[PDB]
Design an enzyme around this catalytic site. Structure first.
Site, PDB file in Angstrom:
ATOM      1  N   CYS B 157       0.753  -1.231   0.000  1.00  0.00           N
ATOM      2  CA  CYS B 157       0.000   0.000   0.000  1.00  0.00           C
ATOM      3  C   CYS B 157       0.789   1.290   0.000  1.00  0.00           C
ATOM      4  O   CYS B 157       0.221   2.382  -0.126  1.00  0.00           O
ATOM      5  CB  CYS B 157      -0.987   0.054   1.179  1.00  0.00           C
ATOM      6  SG  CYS B 157      -2.478  -0.893   0.932  1.00  0.00           S
ATOM      7  N   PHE B 208     -10.620  -3.470   0.966  1.00  0.00           N
ATOM      8  CA  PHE B 208      -9.921  -3.471  -0.310  1.00  0.00           C
ATOM      9  C   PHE B 208     -10.890  -3.418  -1.485  1.00  0.00           C
ATOM     10  O   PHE B 208     -11.849  -4.184  -1.542  1.00  0.00           O
ATOM     11  CB  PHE B 208      -9.057  -4.722  -0.470  1.00  0.00           C
ATOM     12  CG  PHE B 208      -7.820  -4.766   0.387  1.00  0.00           C
ATOM     13  CD1 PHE B 208      -6.964  -3.682   0.473  1.00  0.00           C
ATOM     14  CD2 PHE B 208      -7.465  -5.948   1.040  1.00  0.00           C
ATOM     15  CE1 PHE B 208      -5.799  -3.758   1.226  1.00  0.00           C
ATOM     16  CE2 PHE B 208      -6.304  -6.027   1.792  1.00  0.00           C
ATOM     17  CZ  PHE B 208      -5.475  -4.935   1.890  1.00  0.00           C
ATOM     18  N   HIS B 304      -2.444   8.068   1.876  1.00  0.00           N
ATOM     19  CA  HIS B 304      -3.010   6.771   1.571  1.00  0.00           C
ATOM     20  C   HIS B 304      -4.067   6.384   2.614  1.00  0.00           C
ATOM     21  O   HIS B 304      -3.753   6.266   3.793  1.00  0.00           O
ATOM     22  CB  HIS B 304      -1.947   5.674   1.521  1.00  0.00           C
ATOM     23  CG  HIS B 304      -2.561   4.335   1.299  1.00  0.00           C
ATOM     24  ND1 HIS B 304      -3.220   4.020   0.126  1.00  0.00           N
ATOM     25  CD2 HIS B 304      -2.715   3.280   2.126  1.00  0.00           C
ATOM     26  CE1 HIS B 304      -3.731   2.807   0.242  1.00  0.00           C
ATOM     27  NE2 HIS B 304      -3.445   2.347   1.445  1.00  0.00           N
ATOM     28  N   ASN B 337     -10.171   1.099  -0.412  1.00  0.00           N
ATOM     29  CA  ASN B 337      -8.713   1.017  -0.402  1.00  0.00           C
ATOM     30  C   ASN B 337      -8.198   0.241  -1.620  1.00  0.00           C
ATOM     31  O   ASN B 337      -8.184  -0.990  -1.591  1.00  0.00           O
ATOM     32  CB  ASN B 337      -8.232   0.357   0.905  1.00  0.00           C
ATOM     33  CG  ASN B 337      -6.722   0.233   0.991  1.00  0.00           C
ATOM     34  OD1 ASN B 337      -6.007   0.540   0.034  1.00  0.00           O
ATOM     35  ND2 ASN B 337      -6.229  -0.230   2.131  1.00  0.00           N
TER      36      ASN B 337
END
Lengths: 391, 392
Positions: B157, B208, B304, B337
């Site tokens: 990530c 995710f 992020h 994400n």
């Protein structure tokens, strides 16, 4: 700028290498390999493998895998068996270990504190993990926690060229940067028992060996540092009519290669044009036509020894003097195909033989040279090198 | 040195994004997920997962996986079945396909011929193959066969930061270089059924999503090109006391994550020093102290969104105004994400909202900004950005 750049060409300041301690002589490898995989009764296939080994150009290899480990992990000895979990467990520790060993030797030669390493480029085709082998190496060596890393997994046999191409830009674009560049390759991900249905795997068992090489790269060398080569140009080429020539898939049975075209033929058919285009771009297009070597016999050669036929056909097509491939063939002979690490081992061997034989430069007494990686694509990586003058 | 270098800072010249066609509303995801994995009887675990999804900061995600594919591939629906072969089969095709869709949009924006792309940086944590997704994309797009490629597999990530750090040197050290930078992430390697014995896997099922982003990067922009951000400084940091915070293993059951420490806590405890040291290096130590922004509220933020707690705790510890994280939170809300791709989606969203709202720069009207990737290490990737002035 908020980040200053370096002035001069990226320069190789040290090279260190390492291999596992178990030596496998090629003349006796077919017996070892068919015995440990409980395949001694496969007489015809064993003869085929013996011929592969006899034609390999290899005298010995070093491998971490040996009898005790293979007996304890029978899924590795089977000819086609789910075994990736075991392979990963071995690779995630052995790849950074061997990388650490090579790196320590490089750093010792370099003679500067390891805290001066600003960047790390790590390359392997043996396993993957998160954090990666770059992180593991950073921990093992005690590099600065702000080291800037480039982790290059799963690229295969051309990546010795790739890491130099990548590191060139890092060194040149960052004032004071010192880049540790590591290639570490081990056969635990491809080792498996023999079968007629997986002959590409069997070819790999004749050729692939374990090794790691580490380079310190930097622009603008300090008086206490010791250049041995300069990087001056890099390029990549996907060769024509080469789709599927070298594929490699990471599956539950491990890494499996599938080759579908005449790799030596494709490389040797196109390498003339690759080299002409590289040297035209590097010299003629930059205003240095006068400095362009007059022929491919007037440069030193570092070629990835993917197999002996590649070397043979390139030599023939390019009309190379018999000595051009000598350093390359010596490393194939003494270590086998260590994938990305080979070209760095060859670079080390060349500079050492040049010094030993009192030649005028680290590149067999010649000024310019070419380093070539060959792998999936079919990709050729080209790096143009300058030697350093010797006393 | 036989190869000329560029003069100016690496500049973002175009951004394109893509996602799979299947939309999963988060309000209904627990129902879909426990149904398709034949886990309807796990009523207490489903209640737990519903709470996870309600607390995720996500309104919807896009995924290539759907009921048809999951019914055709039951090993994906089990909680811990050997399934890597199927996952690889899906990923090796879908990752470059989604990257192509994003790249075509970036190239259309850019407006230059694709033959002018000299370099490709390709990043994914979804599968691995030889030749890689870089080669595959080269073929799908018809890029020059001499394109110089940098294939970055399995980083996770933080790598939206990494690809910019890496591409910066490529663009700046090579006169004329134009770099296609692609992050393409999909969930087929991590998707699995629910178990009380694999909760780390379960958090990932709440967070995710799939997506790809493509950037065109180059120094010395031409009059026909359109700058939107400049890259000026980059740094990496392995945070103290963070061994094991985020581990990920590629096994025969697929990709499995194991989180062994408090990730938002570690990031928020250390981010002040990371940012202070970064701005000190970039401005003070380069002789430009006078242009250093006075405070963290005077820069734009691209972080992020690994999960909403990371954003919340960074905001609190750094005393950020409530809207600093808005662009970041918007992307988490609309896409989930998407691993390395998120920060590039956020960069796109930020330049677009800044133009829509007639602000003076692409960075919410501010000159300087920070882009932050977070992932295994625990690694923080920091990139210092300059915005570009707009006409209105």
């Amino acid at each position: 700028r908020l980040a200053q750049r370096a002035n001069g060409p990226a320069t190789v300041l040290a090279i260190g290498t390492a291999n596992p301690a178990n030596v496998f002589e090629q003349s006796s490898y077919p017996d070892f390999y068919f015995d440990i995989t409980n395949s001694q009764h496969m007489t015809e296939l064993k003869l085929k493998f013996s011929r592969m080994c006899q034609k390999s150009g290899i005298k010995k290899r070093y491998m971490h895998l040996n009898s005790e480990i293979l007996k304890a992990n029978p899924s590795l000895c089977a000819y086609w068996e789910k075994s990736l979990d075991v392979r990963q467990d071995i690779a995630v520790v052995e790849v950074p270990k061997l990388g650490k060993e090579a790196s320590l030797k490089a750093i010792k030669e370099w003679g500067q504190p390891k805290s001066k390493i600003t960047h790390l480029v790590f390359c392997t085709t043996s396993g993957v993990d998160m954090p990666g082998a770059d992180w593991a190496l950073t921990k093992l060596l005690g590099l600065r926690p702000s080291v800037k890393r480039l982790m290059m997994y799963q690229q295969g046999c051309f990546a010795g060229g790739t890491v130099l191409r990548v590191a060139k830009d890092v060194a040149e674009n960052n004032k004071g940067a010192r880049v540790l560049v590591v290639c570490s390759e081990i056969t635990c991900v491809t080792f498996r028992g023999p079968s007629e249905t997986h002959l590409d795997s069997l070819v790999g068992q004749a050729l692939f060996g374990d090794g790691a090489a580490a380079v310190i790269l930097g622009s603008d060398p300090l008086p206490e540092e010791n250049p041995c080569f300069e990087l001056h140009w890099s390029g990549s080429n996907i060769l024509p009519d080469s789709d599927g020539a070298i594929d490699g898939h990471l599956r539950e049975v491990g890494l499996t290669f599938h080759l579908m075209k005449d790799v030596p033929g494709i490389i040797s058919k196109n390498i003339g044009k690759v080299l002409n285009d590289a040297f035209r771009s590097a010299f003629d297009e930059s205003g240095n036509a006068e400095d362009r070597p007059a022929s491919v016999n007037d440069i030193f050669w570092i070629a990835h020894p993917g197999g002996p036929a590649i070397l043979d056909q390139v030599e023939e097509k390019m009309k190379l003097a018999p000595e051009k491939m000598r350093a390359t063939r010596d490393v194939l002979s003494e270590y086998g195909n260590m994938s990305s690490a080979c070209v760095l081992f060859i670079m080390d061997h060349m500079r050492r033989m040049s010094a030993q034989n009192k030649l005028q430069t680290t590149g067999e007494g010649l000024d310019w040279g070419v380093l070539l990686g060959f792998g999936p694509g079919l990709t050729v990586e080209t790096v143009l090198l300058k030697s350093i003058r010797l006393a």
